[PDB]
Design a protein around this nucleic acid. Structure first.
Lengths: 76, 77, 77, 76
DNA sequence: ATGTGACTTATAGTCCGTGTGATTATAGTCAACAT
DNA sequence: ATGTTGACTATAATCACACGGACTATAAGTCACAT
């Protein structure tokens, strides 16, 4: 697998938790499948930008805040 | 179509020109098709994080500084 | 246009496919642009003997062999 | 220079002679410039196929006869 | 007759990119059953 | 609640090709002057 893809997934999970969201709720809020979300967080999916974008909207987080976080997570 | 995509595709081109690369060098170095690099810049196209990573390696740029330029482009008026 | 050209054009393609090459491979080994190889096959362009020679070397074929197939294609019905 | 180019030129000169033509006359007959022809025969020109075709018309020699000859010439 | 040289102008050949049908690999989406 | 296994189907990604515009190298065509 990929380093970036792992950090992306980790970040998605991180933000979901600091917001006290469940996966079920993250999937409802972004209209995607819960098993889809699950899959990403267990790093079994290689998402596209479009999908990533839907997940950010579901997390209620701006692109910028996401990447700010993704950068920080990337640096150990 | 997608907000972030045209930002990603814009930044891939920006860097590519900054580094005085041509499309088909980058297509080689990124270990993706000739026409895919074109298609990404040309229209936008919906790439995969793995493909984006390949391109970053190809732009000879780090994940970090890519995303830093990504943020800057998003923030523009 | 020109009689001999489209024949030369035809034979370059024929050989190229007989050898399972692609235009990309060919323009590769002929050290010409892939645009030019396309241009030749497409619209029978007016190449120079030197360029033809490069293409022969690219097709991994000899002067002789080429011209022998050239003669054949000219003679056909 | 090129090997092929020299033998094309040699052939052009060979045929012009076997026929008894001057350069002046090969130029007239093919509607090309005499210095143009002189250049080719000293092999100071890299013809295009089109030009070669005009010289064949001037020599009154079919493509086939020209190439049959060029081949033979090519093999020392 | 032929052979130079040198000087325009057409075009051969280069270089970077666009746009496209067809095929292959794979993400997108949604089942059934788990815990 | 979340995890996992197959699935089906959309589409990401590949591969071979056509096509254009702009630029550079050089062949095409014509002088003058040799011999």
């Amino acid at each position: 697998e990929s380093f970036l893809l792992s950090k992306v997934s980790f970040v998605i999970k991180k933000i979901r938790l600091e917001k006290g969201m469940t996966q079920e709720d993250l999937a409802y809020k972004s209209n995607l499948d819960r098993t889809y979300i699950s899959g990403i967080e267990r790093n079994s999916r290689n998402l596209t930008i479009k999908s990533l974008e839907l997940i950010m909207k579901g997390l209620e987080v701006s692109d910028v805040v996401f990447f700010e976080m993704l950068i920080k997570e990337i640096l150990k």
